[PDB]
Design a protein around this nucleic acid. Structure first.
Ligand SMILES: [Mg+2]
Ligand SMILES: [Mg+2]
Ligand SMILES: [Mg+2]
Ligand SMILES: [Mg+2]
Ligand SMILES: [Mg+2]
Ligand SMILES: [Mg+2]
Ligand SMILES: [Mg+2]
Ligand SMILES: [Mg+2]
Ligand SMILES: [Mg+2]
Ligand SMILES: [Mg+2]
Ligand SMILES: [Mg+2]
Ligand SMILES: [Mg+2]
Lengths: 120, 374, 325, 98
RNA sequence: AGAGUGUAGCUUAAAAGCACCCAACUUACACUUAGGAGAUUCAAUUGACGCUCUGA
RNA sequence: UUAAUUUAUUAAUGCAAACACCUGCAUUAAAAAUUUCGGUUCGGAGCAGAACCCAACCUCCGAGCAGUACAUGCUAAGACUUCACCAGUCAAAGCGAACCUCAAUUGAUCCAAUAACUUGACGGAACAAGUUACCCUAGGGGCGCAAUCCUAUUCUAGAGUCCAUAUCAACAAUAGGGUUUACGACCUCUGUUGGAUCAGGACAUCCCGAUGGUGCAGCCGCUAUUAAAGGUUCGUUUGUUCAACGAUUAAAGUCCUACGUGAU
RNA sequence: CCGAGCCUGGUGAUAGCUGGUUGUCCAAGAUAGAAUCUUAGUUCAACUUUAAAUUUGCCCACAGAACCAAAUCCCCUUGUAAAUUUAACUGUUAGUCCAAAGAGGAACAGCUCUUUGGACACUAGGAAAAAACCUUGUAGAGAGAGUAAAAAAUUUAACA
RNA sequence: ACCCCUAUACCUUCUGAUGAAUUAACUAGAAAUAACUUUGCAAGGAGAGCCAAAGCUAAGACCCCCGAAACCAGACGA
């Protein structure tokens, strides 16, 4: 009987060796997370299909993001096996309305304050 | 097994007396007995004569053991009641209850219409009050209308042939009988048609259901061989006579040739019985039109298996637990497939062990029953 | 399924092996007493209440009882006079507080005026309403006086030596509910002299509206340790007289505890209307005490088997007619 | 037979509450009954059931004999049907200011 | 000599309720009605007066 | 067609109608005509002496009755509804009151009467055979040899308590039955009662053997145990395992074996 | 053409039986049960879909759900967008295969028969060929680019 | 031009095998009751009736083709 099946809480239990292996720290978590699809909407639970629909993941291999709330955490972990998340960082400040236009996303995590036209 | 039910020493000794026919409880009996001993109001559909009456009675005996004798004061009604649709079924139930209550303290009584009401309403029958009483609905309704019995004193009710008790002739008298509503209600049957079960829902509150065997149309017993009559009705009785000639072989070997014939109409049963008695067959006929004393004598003879050929009307299709039932002929195929299956389960009522022969005649109205035969 | 009792089932332990060894309710009063003892318990299967609800003095009393028995002997019993005046005086002296608290709870005076916090009145206070010269109308806890006889200010007796007497109608007349209409305000009374204390609010007559049921007016005196200031002169304004006793007792009566209370009923009368017209200078209101009306059944297309009363329910009355003249 | 209206259902006065032969249903607050041993509403409000000990009237002598036959520690208990009135009896409304 | 100690017979009563008995109706019993008899062992939380048990 | 049903039509009768002929009505046939041949009776006393019940083509009194009536008040919310109405019912609050005899004396539905009220002797579907190896349209699927069965069996692996060879037996293997399948188209268009026979098995033994008790002196018996090692006849009536008849016998016991045994 | 001559009318006879039934473009839209002289058909049954009228649904967290395993249902928030009554017609119901759960038969089988989940009778790339395995989903052109699934591995008998 | 690379003939029962040599011409949805939409009038509507407690009149839209063997009358055939 295939179902939305139970998985342990240890799947979301990190390790200090893991936090070193990953780029994460136990303190000061991420403010917003990003997500993407790299697996088929086909051949999973239809419940999970509408879950990915709820995720705004009707595109695929395209970026999207949300606020990584615990409810959002559970929603993502429901469809985690098909999806990927990213620590959608922003080393600079958040985009002010004065700087409303010049923003972008560099895949390592950067949100651009001003993506100008000349190099460094 | 039976010891899992915590039977009393009288109950354990009676169960040991039921050996080798009872060495352990049946699986349906295992499912039924302690849940009833849990006091839950429920209905159980299972094999006829599968010890289901004993499974209901053992938990009833345990519940009556927890009941005080002070409710057994004079003039009141019983606390343990059972219902049967036929006087013969009620008499058989009362006879079975009197064996178990010989080593117990429960008083067992029977009530049915067409019998002596002086003995029914006797001072040691109605007024002294009993623990176990199996009663027909008509006699009980007459007693309640005449204040010869009560309904506030009941504590454990059993509905045998509850589907037959759910008959349109039988539902109104049962509802009139329906009375303390907190009593523990248990119903027993062979199968539950849906249109009657919701009728139970008219007087139900979170009950339980215990079903046995296949959940589909459990038409064919694995221990019963069945045949289809590929011939017209005109010589079919003659073919039945030929089957009687075949039953002549069954009369030859001593392997018991107790034959039960299904007849739809009492007058048709009388005509067929006059033909068979004319045909030098040792046949006895029981019907709803038979005299009550004559029916009682015929039922006692069939209990003794005195008449190897016995015809039965619509009054005697289901519920039968007859020893040595080896020959069953639906001389008239039953108008209900449930009725045909119930007549089939009436024979070989010792369980999955005692074998028997089944032959059913086929008529034109039963042509649509051929699809039911599929 | 099968629902048994949640708590202990009745008649379970008293069964035992020997049922005939039970004492049995030989007397019907014994069974009634056992049933009342059970009914005092709240039980676990719910009920109607679930949905709706010194040695020297003893020796002296024993000597007095022995003397009374010797005076009777028997012969006086075979019909003792037992005067109720001395009995009432001794009851007011000894056990008057519990009965007074019970009466105050029954009248709802502590729950309404004081917003709860009922207390046993230590000081026995009874009022005497001046009706002519002789006699004076006695007002105990709950004694009823009409507004006609209650035109003038009444006297009070408590047999005590500061004090503060007040009078409030807890019925909440005229204005909004959860309020009491003040009638008199005596403060800093030295000793038993009520006139020694000042009178802030002058005494006004009762003004119960017509057909408004019965009104509850209570006069209360509280034990005062030190005299305190107050505040309203003789006024007929209803806004100044509107004050709750709970608020006054909470944040103003800090060093003050109750001592005595006397309750009375008030109904509409000629003097109430006279005070309304002359003193209040306003029209007297009258109340109806009207019950709810019938729901009236559902109207269908045809009356079916019913009589002629089916088609005449939901309008009014007596002479209406056809299309048009 | 049986209970016509379940407890908690709002019912007008005179509506059939519970009908039974041999009194399985007993009377609580505001529950009328006639010669048919049936319970009916006597007021508008919400119906409730309560398991309270039943004490028969002194007119019933057989019931008195049965209660005497009950033990001194025996308690009867019975399911009575109370009718809590939802609406009040009436209210006083200011007629006129004469 | 030591322990337990203490409201009439009984009370996880603080001077009450169950119990006692008398009558009348009872063959008798029971109920009821009329009755009355009934106890915190004494001195300042402490002591002894009274009893049971363990000894001699 | 003796399935069912008629009988349009004849032919007879008989009855009508008219004074041998015609018409009408019944019955009977002949002949027809219309339609069927499915699927996978009831009580009191005793027997029955002290809670029930209890039996007799048991012992005695009785019953199909008779007599005596028809607050069993009024008012009044709110409900059930004969699936309409009519007819019927339940019932709160109020006014006015309390606070059948018999001993049995009977019975049931159904069809009746009766407009009805009332009066009469534990479950109640509309019905029709057999053939088409001629049906009709339409749907569904000798000669050659031994590849196969084949047996005077070799090596003996191995079972057979041991022991390959008392017996069996596999792998491969000397080979060669014309009885079985085709290959080539070689001369061509689950049967049945007795009986006969043979009988096998059981004792629950008819007799015989050995005993115990006996209302066993003895002869004859009866009962009970043990004993299947043995037998338990001949004929007559009738095909009947039974039954009647005679001569018998120590006894003429019983059944089972497909109520044994017909691939004669 | 004799198994009942031939022909004309009646005769557009009749069976629920097969097959075929004509140009375009937008909006929505694929498998549950019960009766039936019935499974080659039809009727109660559900879904829809549309037209109108009326404001919360799907995903869930606590508590709770029985005596004779996965679990499942009622189920605050979260994210996201549709849900309840009234009506009309049609249309599926004889589904295939795969992973799990049972019953039967050899525990043969592209065999049967009920519950859960998919896709599937509908595009493209790859497994050699490809109704079912993996990726991928949804519109056009460009002679750019990133990416996904992606070709089988493999060998031995030393001893004091 | 072809040889270069991709490329399981069409229509259809199916769940994944019958027909069509090829042209050119013929050959196969019409019953409006209800409801809706759009017009005219309005407590009346309409060129006697029918219906109306917002209706009544006008129009619009749903309904194949091929294919049995049968049977009866009336002729005609040796
Ligand atoms: Mg239903
Ligand atoms: Mg089914
Ligand atoms: Mg009711
Ligand atoms: Mg034609
Ligand atoms: Mg046609
Ligand atoms: Mg067809
Ligand atoms: Mg049918
Ligand atoms: Mg039929
Ligand atoms: Mg069919
Ligand atoms: Mg085409
Ligand atoms: Mg061709
Ligand atoms: Mg044709």
């Amino acid at each position: 009987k295939f179902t939305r099946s139970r998985i342990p809480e240890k799947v979301f239990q990190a390790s200090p060796e893991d936090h070193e292996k990953y780029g994460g720290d136990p303190q000061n978590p991420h403010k917003l997370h990003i997500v993407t699809r790299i697996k088929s909407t086909r051949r999973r639970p239809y419940w999970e299909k509408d879950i990915i629909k709820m995720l705004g993941l009707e595109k695929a291999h395209t970026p999207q993001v949300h606020k990584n709330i615990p409810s959002v955490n559970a929603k993502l972990k429901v469809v985690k096996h098909l999806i990927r998340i990213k620590p959608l960082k922003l080393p600079q400040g958040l985009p002010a309305e004065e700087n409303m236009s010049n923003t972008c996303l560099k895949s390592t995590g950067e949100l651009v304050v001003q993506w100008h036209l000349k190099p460094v | 097994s039976f010891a899992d039910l915590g039977l009393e020493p009288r109950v354990l000794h009676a169960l040991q007396e039921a050996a080798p026919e009872v060495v352990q409880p049946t699986t349906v009996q295992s499912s039924t007995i302690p849940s009833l001993l849990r006091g839950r109001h429920v209905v159980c559909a299972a094999e006829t004569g599968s010890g289901k009456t004993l499974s209901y009675l053992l938990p009833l005996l345990q519940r009556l053991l927890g009941q005080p004798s002070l409710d057994s004061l004079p003039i009141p009604a019983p606390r343990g009641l059972v219902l049967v649709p036929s006087r013969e079924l009620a008499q058989q139930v009362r006879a079975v209850a009197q064996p178990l209550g010989r080593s117990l303290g429960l008083l067992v009584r029977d009530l049915e219409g067409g019998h002596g009401m002086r003995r029914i309403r006797l001072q040691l029958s109605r007024q002294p009050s009993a623990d176990v009483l199996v009663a027909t609905p008509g006699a009980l309704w007459k007693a309640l209308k005449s204040r010869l019995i009560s309904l506030e004193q009941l504590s454990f009710l059993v509905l045998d042939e509850a589907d037959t008790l759910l008959d349109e002739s039988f539902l109104e008298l049962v509802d009139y009988i329906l009375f303390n509503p907190k009593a523990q209600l248990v119903l027993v049957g062979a199968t539950f048609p849906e249109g009657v079960g919701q009728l139970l829902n008219k007087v139900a509150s979170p009950d339980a259901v215990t079903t046995i065997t296949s959940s589909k149309l459990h038409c064919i017993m694995p221990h019963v061989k069945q045949t289809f009559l590929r011939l017209k009705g005109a010589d079919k009785v003659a073919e039945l006579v030929h089957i009687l000639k075949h039953r002549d072989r069954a009369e030859r070997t001593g392997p018991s040739g107790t034959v039960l014939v299904f007849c739809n109409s009492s007058s048709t049963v009388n005509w067929l019985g006059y033909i068979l008695d004319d045909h030098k067959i040792q046949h006895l006929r029981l019907q709803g039109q038979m005299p009550a004393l004559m029916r009682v004598g015929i039922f006692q003879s069939f209990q003794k298996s005195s008449r190897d050929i016995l015809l039965c009307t619509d009054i005697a299709s289901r519920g039968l637990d007859s020893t040595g039932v080896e020959l069953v002929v639906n001389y008239d195929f039953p108008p209900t497939l449930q009725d045909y299956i119930h007549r089939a389960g009436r024979v070989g009522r010792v369980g999955s062990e005692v074998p028997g022969t089944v032959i059913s005649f086929v008529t034109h109205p039963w042509d649509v029953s051929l699809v039911q035969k599929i | 399924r099968r629902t048994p009792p949640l708590g202990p089932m009745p008649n379970s332990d008293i069964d035992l092996s020997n049922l005939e060894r039970l004492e049995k309710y030989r007397s019907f009063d014994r069974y009634r007493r056992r049933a009342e003892q059970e009914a005092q318990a709240p039980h676990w299967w719910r009920t109607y209440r679930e949905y709706f609800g010194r040695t020297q003095q003893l020796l002296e009393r024993k000597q007095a009882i022995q003397e009374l028995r010797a005076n009777v002997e028997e012969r006086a019993a075979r019909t003792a006079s037992v005067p109720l005046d001395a009995v009432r005086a001794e009851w007011e002296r000894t056990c008057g507080p519990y009965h007074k608290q019970r009466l105050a709870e029954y009248y709802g005076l502590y729950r309404d005026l004081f917003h709860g916090a009922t207390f046993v009145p230590r000081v026995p206070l009874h009022v005497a309403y001046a009706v002519g010269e002789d006699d004076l109308m006695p007002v105990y806890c709950g004694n009823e006086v009409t507004p006609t006889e209650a035109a003038q200010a009444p006297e009070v007796t408590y047999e005590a030596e500061l004090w503060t007497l007040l009078l409030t109608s807890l019925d909440g007349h005229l204005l909004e509910p959860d309020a009491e209409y003040l009638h008199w305000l005596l403060t800093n009374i030295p000793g038993n002299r009520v006139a020694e204390g000042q009178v802030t609010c002058p005494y006004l007559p009762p003004f119960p509206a017509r057909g408004s049921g019965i009104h509850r007016l209570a006069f209360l005196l509280f034990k005062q340790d030190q005299p305190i200031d107050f505040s309203p002169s003789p006024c007929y304004q209803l806004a100044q007289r509107t004050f709750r006793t709970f608020d006054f007792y909470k944040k103003h009566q800090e060093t003050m505890t109750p001592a005595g209370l006397s309750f009375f009923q008030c109904r509409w009368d000629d003097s109430v209307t006279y005070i309304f017209h002359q003193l209040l200078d306003m029209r007297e209101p009258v109340f109806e005490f009207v019950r709810p009306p019938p729901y009236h059944p559902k109207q269908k297309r045809f009356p079916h088997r019913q009589p002629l009363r089916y088609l005449d329910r939901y309008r009014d009355s007596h002479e209406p007619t056809y299309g048009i003249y | 037979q049986g209970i016509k209206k379940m407890e908690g259902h709002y019912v007008h006065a005179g509506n059939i509450i519970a009908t039974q032969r041999h009194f399985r249903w007993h009377p609580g607050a505001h529950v009328g009954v006639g010669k048919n041993k049936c319970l009916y509403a006597l007021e508008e409000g919400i119906v409730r059931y309560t398991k309270e000990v039943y004490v028969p009237h002194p007119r019933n002598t057989e019931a008195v004999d049965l209660i005497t036959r009950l033990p001194k520690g025996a308690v009867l208990y019975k399911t009575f049907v109370h009718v809590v009135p939802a609406k009040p009896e009436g209210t006083f409304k200011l007629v006129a200011m004469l």
